[PDB]
Write a protein that binds this ligand. Structure first.
Ligand SMILES: NC1=NC(=O)C2=NC(=O)SC2=N1
Ligand SMILES: NC1=NC(=O)C2=NC(=O)SC2=N1
Ligand SMILES: NC1=NC(=O)C2=NC(=O)SC2=N1
Ligand SMILES: NC1=NC(=O)C2=NC(=O)SC2=N1
Ligand SMILES: [Zn+2]
Ligand SMILES: [Zn+2]
Ligand SMILES: [Zn+2]
Ligand SMILES: [Zn+2]
Ligand SMILES: [Zn+2]
Ligand SMILES: [Zn+2]
Ligand SMILES: [Zn+2]
Ligand SMILES: [Zn+2]
Ligand SMILES: [Zn+2]
Ligand SMILES: [Zn+2]
Lengths: 167, 181, 180, 173, 120, 120, 180, 173, 167, 181
């Protein structure tokens, strides 16, 4: 994991790289609006990737419309959307699981699988289903991905009920 | 302006800086998903800032037409994609333009190029709004201009608006534009 | 059950605790806007928990009717207001109910009374969902019961499928599609 | 202060335990065991605002800001949206600062009309602009059925110029 | 009311306005009826289908009974392979959805799934 | 029910559910009430405003009378600069929209225009 | 007015003309689907023109009520079905009515009867619009009447603004916005 | 033929004049003077279809085709939409040809079920494809309240393969 | 006006120009799908420009949602939308007025004015108002233009009522 | 492929043909609104056909990633603009893509480039649909591919669909894709 001291050590290094980008784009890094941009861009990129340092009944429970912000690892442009989860844990820590994996350089299919595997390893339930619907700024087209584990993968009725209960 | 010679020259400089950023973030730039990221991120940033390559004078070449029109012309829901100048993160939205011509009108494709020239740069929404309004005013010299930008940068939309001429002075003109958009 | 005698007896006890809370939060309980807050907050809490006053069997009085089973019966978009037992903060939502009768139907207003008895209590959404389903099952004894509760504490959706609604993919699918 | 919060937390928990008994519940059942403390922390969180403090030619609007507050009459939440608009004089409101202003006043025992005025006065004192407009639309859980309460405070050119006022109200739709 | 067509495929008449009285409390309940049938080469005139809905809806009723009566009336009039009737209504003593599936609409899952999707 | 706030700006409570009986035919009429007022430094508690709507709506009524009664009740309780009440309802013997504007809501065109736009 | 005696007398006359039309179109009037068409078409035409049977004054019977004028009264989205007098083909639409009473209101069902009397006739949309407005004006004698008819014969929208609704920009604007 | 149309036009006008008198109207009033001829031309136009005649691996669908027809029971129009789908065998239906097929059958005294089958059979005979599907959704003015009648005809793989049938019905939504 | 014989004479000339375009684009005009394209493109362009040969109560009458297809004169790409008219003439001939001006190489502002002037010259009414809302393929942004003549330009109440009655 | 050298060489040829068309239609090519139309029409036609300049092999460079994923991936509502090959008139719509990967996935921007390469040409909707499906199949070799194109060319939408592999064979797979789009 990347500790807090790693973040403080790499912050001036990230700012130096963003200063370089401002010059390479044709901008004047000395103009008032850009003066603090190398540090602000560095802090933003550290915040969007803070998940690297992080670590942790007879009814279907679903938490839908959870807002999600991730970064596309191919172009370093954000992708934003919603996560729908099905499977006992509450909204808190479920949100924490989403934020640990979404706050990284990702691909939507990987992010989807990591969320379902994290819920499975935390709760050890009969099954888990995760659907992510997001808009990629690296391309208004929506990308929908899904990962089913346990009874959500094996039982078609369970799988079908979860997919209908999102609307 | 930024030429294509400048773009090819600065591409390795941008890629080298993005390689540096991947290492500083704790990532391994050799993993499959990151291998070409320095170049792809550099090309994306060049594309989001391609408005620096253009000039308002060049955009305005063969752009004005004498139509003998003096009534409100509105172009609404123009898609707009821009770069936040504070954090280098994109912001996306729409532009709604309205003007009252003094017999001269602006070609629709040229109005879209005005929005593109200023939006594809490192910007602040209020500045982008004013630049589009000032460009239309300087090109057409009309009775009035109205420009409204609504964009997503917590969850909420930012709306900015520049009202010039009869759009600032006449309540009926301003009300009509805002209701029609 | 909780009688009206209990309510009038516990009202000063609740108001005294709310007066204490206002002081502990840093507020001045003498300011105009707070003067009657101990009593208003106490009455609100009593109202949000009035389901303790009722029993399952008194609402089942004159609630069952003999009909020759009109296959699946659904009552959707039933407004629901409940209290989170973890923090004593409200949660609001909708209840969608469906059942396949065994020649016995439940009166519409009585179905709403079942939702009210359990929702007006300190709850957890999963428990509230199961209690509504079990109450319908015990009252009608039907082929199956499906209860879907969607609430805001982003939404949480819970569901209890008893009997036919658990076993048969077709009946469960038909219910879930009809509640759109 | 935070010293006050740590001191009053057991006092709040004790009062919530008293409420659990007065409602007819058994505070010893598993689901209620930690409820006095959880309810106390939640109430402290909903009232943390008591602890807190502090060349242009275009209208700037930030609409659909999520807002959550407490009805001071019944101690039941009221949830909604805040729409802010201003005409700047050399100073522009930072989005983080605007959010903190909404938070400082919403995290208190409130009346929607007061909350609306306080946000407007805070923006006026921070930016010193030509004018400010604040509209709050919220659902009150006291009324328990889905009625919205809309309040507004218009300062400066937003109160004086009808065109300015009307443009802000149309743009927040 | 009955016409001979070379037709053995599903005929649906959806969104038929319905106005009935709840017998339990003497308060009205208003909604829509969705009818579907698989004819045995003969079809029912549209205006006659509306009259069937009217005869039963204009009475003191229970939604479950009203749904069954319309379905039984169509079955007895046309003698088709199957009938499906869905009633969705708002009760003034408060949507309640009831359905009666007969013949191929009860027996064949594909047939009822198609009817239920076509009425949305 | 009345509270003193330093408030002289428009307060609106829209989409209040309303259930009333039509006196002419003894059939219900259901809808929404939209209330607006300009206070003279004092405001009305939200729950009390709902109780005013309830006292008059739960009777044998005519929509025009119900609208006026709510407006007159708010005026007499708060004594504000102006009051506006709009009722939109569906009559079961069939939307009917009625409105009563008092004080600044009747006199100032800007004030009524603002109220009518804010309730959409 | 057109009596029910007139209807039964003219039914064979209408059926005979529809039989003639079926032959002139190239059809065989003996085929199953056409056998009763002369009578069905005749009854349909009689139904679409049943407004000739009623008079303006018989629906004005027990229609006016003395109320202390609840300012503007609006009844919007009134379904309307009429017959184009140019080609004898139906046109369907909605009627939005508004009036400012002079302490005299019209019963809701009677307002619907005014729309029906004029719409169930061989019409032109502009005439139907004016007739509804003139009927309300003559029945209540109000400060003003506004009638907007939107129909499909792309939509045609016609409007008649009498008195206050013609003169005052504010009352006309308020009416047109409220009918959204 | 067109000779038949010109011959029967005065006969149709004479019958519409008779209708105008039987309804209680005055056929001499200005607005009705030309109605017999206008009604006759309209009825001829609504029935002009009596005069008229005549390597791939993907489903092709043309949805939301406007359709206007006449109820043969009451002589009142029924208006709606036609959704056509086919799985081609070397031949693709031209959009102009598809429109003419819908027109040839809709411009007659019809029953919706018959109109649906005729369009399907015409596409099958023109393209000779693996299958055809036709769905007609229409509002009948006989029912006079806004009920839609939906009819369908499935031929070939559209009747035999459930997956094909289901894909067509989902794609026309 | 461009007579029918002008159209028949210029049809092979238009086909020859479209054949030239196919070759200049990099396509093979001999492939089956392109063989008849020079003639089909010529007939389509003649149809889109057929308006060049063409020529011709106390209530507000409005005809809204009239479909409109025109050609952008700057790029020869279509622009499609709706026309809303206010002002006695029926739907027929009103549609003919729309089609005479829309079937030409146009600019939306000009098309709008020509429709209002044609209605004014045909009916001689107290006033006329024309609003055109269209999507230009030469750029989903909507362009809205309007022209008011007579009482629609002079009386604000008349103007305001017409603009509200479109929804 | 069509190079930029070809584009500059063919621009006067296209403009000359558009000048000819303006004269043949009865217009005066000297009027203000038409003066630059030969060049603007030529540039527009070049832009609508820029897919001829690209190659599927070039688009597929650094496009496949090994993600250890075997579940359905859908990209819906991809805007699509194309040229009708019969009359040279544009047609516009959307593309919905779905595939079941055999552990290998396609980069989102590369999927958009596949749609762009084939859509920016003189086309027939059925061919465009099949080409996108065949390109994905050949690049990823997945368990199945589904491509649905809905476009506006009387008033009505044309929907075409290519279902390959498990999308053709498994009813549940096909049903899931069609409901999710
Ligand atoms: N709602 C629900 N859906 C399932 O699929 C299920 N499977 C089980 O074992 S318990 C249960 N509840
Ligand atoms: N958009 C805008 N609206 C106003 O009302 C205004 N008033 C001013 O002084 S600067 C300005 N801009
Ligand atoms: N899209 C599509 N759907 C089918 O059902 C089909 N069946 C075939 O033989 S080719 C084909 N394509
Ligand atoms: N509806 C309507 N609106 C007007 O503005 C008008 N002016 C007139 O002279 S007659 C008339 N009718
Ligand atoms: Zn990317
Ligand atoms: Zn930002
Ligand atoms: Zn909670
Ligand atoms: Zn309250
Ligand atoms: Zn009842
Ligand atoms: Zn009544
Ligand atoms: Zn007509
Ligand atoms: Zn019929
Ligand atoms: Zn253009
Ligand atoms: Zn085409």
């Amino acid at each position: 994991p990347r500790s807090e001291e790693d973040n403080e050590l790499n912050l001036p290094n990230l700012a130096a790289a963003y200063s370089s980008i401002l010059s390479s784009l044709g901008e004047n890094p000395q103009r008032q609006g850009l003066l603090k941009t190398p540090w602000r861009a560095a802090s933003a990129m550290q915040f969007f990737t803070k998940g690297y340092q992080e670590t942790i009944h007879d009814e279907m429970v679903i938490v839908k419309d959870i807002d999600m912000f991730s970064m596309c690892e191919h172009h370093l442009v954000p992708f934003v959307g919603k996560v729908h989860i099905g499977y006992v844990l509450g909204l808190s820590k479920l949100a924490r699981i989403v934020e640990i994996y979404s706050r990284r350089l990702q691909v939507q299919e990987r992010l989807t699988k990591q969320i379902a595997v994290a819920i499975t390893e935390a709760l050890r339930p009969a099954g888990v289903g995760v659907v992510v619907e997001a808009t990629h700024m690296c391309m208004n087209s929506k990308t929908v991905t899904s990962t089913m584990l346990g009874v959500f993968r094996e039982d078609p009725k369970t799988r079908e009920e979860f997919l209908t209960l999102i609307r």
